[PDB]
Design an enzyme around this catalytic site. Structure first.
Site, mmCIF file in Angstrom:
data_model
loop_
_atom_site.group_PDB
_atom_site.id
_atom_site.type_symbol
_atom_site.label_atom_id
_atom_site.label_comp_id
_atom_site.label_asym_id
_atom_site.label_seq_id
_atom_site.Cartn_x
_atom_site.Cartn_y
_atom_site.Cartn_z
ATOM 1 N N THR A 116 32.940 16.446 17.574
ATOM 2 C CA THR A 116 32.701 17.215 18.828
ATOM 3 C C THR A 116 33.394 18.580 18.709
ATOM 4 O OG1 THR A 116 32.508 15.128 19.883
ATOM 5 C CG2 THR A 116 32.782 17.010 21.391
ATOM 6 N N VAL A 138 25.253 6.636 22.663
ATOM 7 C CA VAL A 138 25.501 7.973 23.270
ATOM 8 C C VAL A 138 26.916 8.011 23.890
ATOM 9 C CG1 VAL A 138 24.602 9.709 24.877
ATOM 10 C CG2 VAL A 138 23.001 8.177 23.721
ATOM 11 N N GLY A 139 27.765 8.901 23.395
ATOM 12 C CA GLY A 139 29.098 9.103 23.970
ATOM 13 C C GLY A 139 29.073 10.146 25.069
ATOM 14 N N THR A 191 36.709 16.022 24.245
ATOM 15 C CA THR A 191 36.523 15.428 22.877
ATOM 16 C C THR A 191 37.326 14.128 22.796
ATOM 17 O OG1 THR A 191 37.086 15.600 20.515
ATOM 18 C CG2 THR A 191 38.221 17.100 22.018
ATOM 19 N N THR A 199 37.201 9.380 22.705
ATOM 20 C CA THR A 199 36.491 8.077 22.827
ATOM 21 C C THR A 199 35.374 8.179 23.876
ATOM 22 O OG1 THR A 199 38.625 7.067 22.278
ATOM 23 C CG2 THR A 199 36.905 5.591 23.059
#
Ligand SMILES: [Cl-]
Ligand SMILES: [Cl-]
Ligand code: NA
Ligand code: NA
Lengths: 134, 159, 152, 134
Positions: free
Chosen positions: D1, D30-31, D52, D54
């Site tokens: 990211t 998808v995060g 940015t 988990t």
């Protein structure tokens, strides 16, 4: 879109939402229904929320989480937070629709800014309430 | 506070001039049966998470409501379904977007919550995850209804 | 009081000084580009778009060229842009044939009825509006492949 | 990211986020990066945020919008809101990462709970600051 919210005898809150979108939609497009804090949110500290209506606006507004934050941080009642989001903030962005919400004390609200919203609720052990129109 | 359930089957331009009392009662009867199932489960001591899962599975099954069976049609005369579930206790969530071969997207959303380190899966991968865990592959033609196809024709021009 | 902040990812960051200096040098060049744009009166939207485009082009950072590998040794890229003036937003998820996902995210914000598009439909939306098709091989770097084997 | 936030000479705020995901991730996951209120948020009246870390935790906690809500409704400063989200609320759900944020008054914060965050910031017409470690 369809959805459900509940408060159980152990004081736990939950929310769920499911949709096929809008008639004639382009494939590979995503509205509010599957997005945490837009279409669907639950926190035992505040509220469970499930939303229906203009997907682009419920995302920009973070409608479901905005109810939780107004109550938890803002100290608004469920009634005041639902009036604020559905009757003032969504229409200002061109959002039409409504939602269903239950708070950690078992207060219930079914606000909408449209002609109608297919809806029903009931306490455990009580007769249900149903509606379509305003 | 008392245990309680609310459900919805969508908001929009629903008008009194549009329906007979009998046509209205078809919607009222469906909403009542689903909230009653939810109230009975709460009264028996079942969880808010299991109650909202079952209520949305029923709303999906009901052809009157735009989720699961009775989904609207896309531009390509297909169906593409999205759903999410969230647990207020653990703050876990699960979600699927863009699925056409799962009969009940809210059950696939609950599997993502309970059986993965993820919140969101999309498309064929979401379907493959669910199939690997015993969920059935369906044809998207199962969602199709005459009423929603007539709504598609009214909203466009024919080529 | 105009101002820019950038990031290139948080995590468990071993390295020599010359290795660390390549990161400091890339961060300094991109933040100075954004500062000069802001000084010249360019919009906050155009500044964050260009800064993230430059972070995408830089192979040191996990976006665009230098994207990490999936469990299948593929690349899947995601991006979002939001304009605080109009509250409009645009996003793409799970794309592999667009060089600069942030530019596709901006096209969705400007031309889509929706906030978000996914996969092959997001790509076809961008191609229909003049954006170029690429092979995801262009994102591959030796360092990120070695990081994949180390994780396995 | 990667990500960027900016306040321009006209008072406009904007945010952008882009990623390749996690090394070894399951494809089709998808995060937070492409989700409004999770990995990216901007509002001229509040804050601009890029995150940015988990993904499933930044989604569940709506990290980017929660900065805006703690400030708007909770009365927290940018620095207080950043401390509470990144050092308290994200670790409580098992999350690691950080974010960059600028408020409408030109305050700037780059909090992280990890060993490092590649980062930089600067006022227009001034020398920039860079950093990697704590
Ligand atoms: Cl040296
Ligand atoms: Cl440093
Ligand atoms: Na249905
Ligand atoms: Na890059």
């Amino acid at each position: 879109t369809v959805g459900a919210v509940a408060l159980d005898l152990d004081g736990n809150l939950a929310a769920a939402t499911s949709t096929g979108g809008m008639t004639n939609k382009l494939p590979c497009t995503v509205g509010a229904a599957p997005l945490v804090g837009a279409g669907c949110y639950a926190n035992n500290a505040s509220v469970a929320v499930s939303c229906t209506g203009t997907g682009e606006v419920f995302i920009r507004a973070l409608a479901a989480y905005d109810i939780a934050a107004l109550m938890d941080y803002g100290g608004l009642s469920l009634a005041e937070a639902c009036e604020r989001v559905v009757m003032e903030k969504l229409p200002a962005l061109g959002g039409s629709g409504g939602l269903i919400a239950i708070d950690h004390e078992g207060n219930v609200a079914l606000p909408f800014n449209t002609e109608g919203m297919y809806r029903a609720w009931g306490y455990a052990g009580d007769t249900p309430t149903t509606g379509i129109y305003r | 506070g008392k245990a309680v359930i609310a459900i919805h089957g969508g908001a929009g331009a629903i008008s009194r001039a549009q329906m007979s009392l009998q046509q209205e009662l078809r919607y009222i009867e469906a909403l009542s049966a689903i909230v009653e199932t939810g109230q009975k489960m709460l009264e028996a001591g079942e969880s808010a998470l299991d109650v909202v899962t079952e209520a949305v599975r029923l709303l999906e099954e009901c052809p009157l409501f735009n989720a699961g069976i009775g989904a609207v049609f896309t531009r390509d005369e297909t169906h593409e379904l999205d759903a999410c579930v969230m647990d207020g206790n653990t703050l876990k969530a699960g979600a699927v977007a863009g699925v056409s071969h799962l009969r009940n997207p809210v059950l696939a959303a609950r599997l993502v919550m309970e059986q993965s380190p993820h919140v969101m899966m999309i498309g064929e991968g979401a379907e493959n995850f669910a199939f690997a865990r015993g969920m059935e592959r369906v044809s998207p033609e199962i969602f199709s209804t005459s009423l929603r196809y007539e709504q598609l024709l009214a909203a466009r021009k024919e080529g």
